[PDB]
């Protein structure tokens, strides 16, 4: 997941099983003050949902990731 | 000598699972799924194929222009010219005969 | 419609293990034209100047044939381990030591 | 995807208010039997389709580059 942050400008999140793509996009914009290009989601084999959130070109996923605190 | 596989999860050779082998810009043979061929619209009186009407699947007629789906004449995309000709001749002759039967 | 074929033999010649005169003579007696050898009736001409080998032909000839004859001559003198027939541009070849 | 042949309709595409980029492609191609020539292809990236103008005259290709709008972004090769 860290490679996508550095290379693909994509942030990877674990999200609620009840949330759809509309809610994930809205939550990311409000929590982090960024813009979202598209969202891809999947259900992991352990029963949790993972979302691939790609930001627009005006934003960098690397500087947002360390602003949150993880690296 | 290069062999191909289905690109969907249907493994059976049904009508909706027909394929055609093509060669890609990458230099390899790959299967291509083709849809079922369309059928020409037929005349409503004699059942013959209509001239000047595009041959498409039913839902594809909603994307093409009206000129593709009609002929500039009465009963354009419904009946052929010969059947329309018989309708006009029959309509005129019978109505004339009705007048002389009245008198 | 005569096509020109040129072979650069400077690299093996400067070492002293290759004889350009012998190579040119070998091509004269082995290029088959319209059948057997010896029918070079003003159709295939091979020249020599000590640094390059130029073959001018109007009859049936190709670069693949030229490489085929060179390899036969190369092994006849036991020189396949050091000399390789390499094409730089179209219809322009060289021997690499 | 769509090839344009008229020079007049090419110039209006470059200022259609929805075009941002264009590219110039130079191909060295041979004629029917003789020496090669320089082929220049002008591609305009529209919102829904890509328009390509192909001209085989080197002299006319130079004039079109000069008349190309400066606002439009041009990619060379």
């Amino acid at each position: 997941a860290m490679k996508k942050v550095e290379d693909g400008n994509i942030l990877v999140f674990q999200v609620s099983m009840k949330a759809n793509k509309y809610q994930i996009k809205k939550a990311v914009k409000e929590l982090y003050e960024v813009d979202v290009l598209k969202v891809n989601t999947l259900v992991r084999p352990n029963g949790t949902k993972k979302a691939y959130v790609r930001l627009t070109a005006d934003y960098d996923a690397l500087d947002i990731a360390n602003r949150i605190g993880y690296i | 000598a290069q062999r191909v596989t289905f690109r969907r999860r249907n493994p059976y050779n049904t009508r909706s699972n027909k394929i055609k082998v093509v060669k890609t810009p990458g230099g390899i043979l790959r299967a291509q799924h083709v849809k079922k061929l369309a059928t020409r619209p037929k005349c409503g009186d004699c059942g013959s194929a209509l001239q000047g009407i595009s041959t498409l699947r039913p839902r594809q007629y909603a994307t093409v222009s009206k000129t593709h789906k009609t002929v500039s004449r009465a009963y354009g995309g419904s009946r052929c010219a010969n059947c329309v000709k018989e309708r006009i001749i029959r309509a005129f002759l019978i109505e004339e005969q009705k007048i002389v039967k009245k008198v | 419609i005569a096509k020109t074929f040129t072979v650069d033999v400077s690299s093996p010649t400067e070492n002293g293990v290759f004889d350009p005169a012998s190579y040119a003579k070998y091509l004269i007696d082995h290029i088959k034209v319209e059948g057997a050898v010896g029918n070079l009736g003003n159709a295939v001409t091979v020249t020599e100047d000590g640094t390059v080998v130029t073959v001018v032909s109007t009859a049936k000839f190709s670069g693949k044939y030229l490489k085929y004859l060179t390899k036969k001559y190369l092994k006849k003198n036991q020189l396949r381990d050091w000399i390789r027939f390499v094409s730089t541009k179209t219809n322009e070849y060289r021997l690499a030591f | 995807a769509r090839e344009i042949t008229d020079i007049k309709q090419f110039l209006e595409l470059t200022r259609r208010a929805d075009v941002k980029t264009a590219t110039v492609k130079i191909n060295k191609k041979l004629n029917k039997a003789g020496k090669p020539f320089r082929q220049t292809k002008f591609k305009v990236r529209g919102s829904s389709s890509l328009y390509t103008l192909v001209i085989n005259d080197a002299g006319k290709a130079k004039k079109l580059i000069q008349s190309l709008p400066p606002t439009l972004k041009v990619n060379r090769l």
Binding site: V43, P45, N46, G47 | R9 | - | -
Partner: protein, 50 residues
């Protein structure tokens, strides 16, 4: 089985998380009698009958 319903996959997820040995610090508790995981399941021995 590649095309599976959500009910089947959800039960598959639960079985995946239960397929672990006994935590070690459990054996050190006061008055502990649990020695190993008695409900361990392996795909080669007993089927889930799901």
């Amino acid at each position: 089985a590649a095309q599976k319903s959500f009910r089947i996959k959800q039960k598959m997820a639960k079985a995946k998380k239960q397929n672990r040995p006994l935590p070690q610090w459990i054996r050190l508790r006061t008055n502990n009698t649990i020695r190993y995981n008695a409900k361990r399941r392996n795909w080669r021995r007993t089927k889930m009958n799901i």
